[PDB]
């Protein structure tokens, strides 16, 4: 706890296969440019107060959603107009599952839908 929880969360995130080290926001755009909507990856944030950012190919182009790490649990940055509290997760696989609806939450009003992590090749 207090550091072990954080480092264990980071570790497991790094290990997940969703995570792309040494990829910028611009490079995420390139990687996701030719991919179908709902293709996503997690990468390092270039922001001072964030470790990680989720990049997702949406119906309306590539969007970026900062990941919050409070208490060593993960959540996606939430609009204060949310009527529900922010769901939070002790692992990234659960986070990702939560935002995989079948054909649901939205971004400012376009659906946020993850479907498949970006693969190498």
């Amino acid at each position: 706890s207090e550091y072990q929880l954080v480092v264990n969360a980071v570790r497991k995130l790094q290990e997940s296969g969703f995570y792309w080290s040494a990829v910028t926001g611009g490079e995420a755009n390139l990687l996701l440019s030719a991919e179908p909507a709902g293709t996503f990856l997690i990468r390092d944030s270039s922001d001072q107060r964030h470790f990680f950012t989720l990049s997702v190919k949406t119906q309306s182009g590539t969007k970026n959603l900062r990941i919050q790490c409070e208490g060593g649990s993960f959540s996606l940055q939430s609009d204060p107009r949310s009527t529900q509290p922010v769901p939070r997760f002790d692992c990234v696989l659960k986070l990702v599952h939560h935002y995989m609806p079948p054909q649901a939450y939205y971004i400012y009003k376009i659906p946020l839908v993850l479907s498949r992590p970006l693969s190498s090749n």
Partner: peptide, 11 residues
């Protein structure tokens, strides 16, 4: 590439 940020509406 323009890098656009968003937040999620949880409702």
């Amino acid at each position: 590439s323009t890098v656009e940020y968003s937040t999620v509406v949880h409702s």
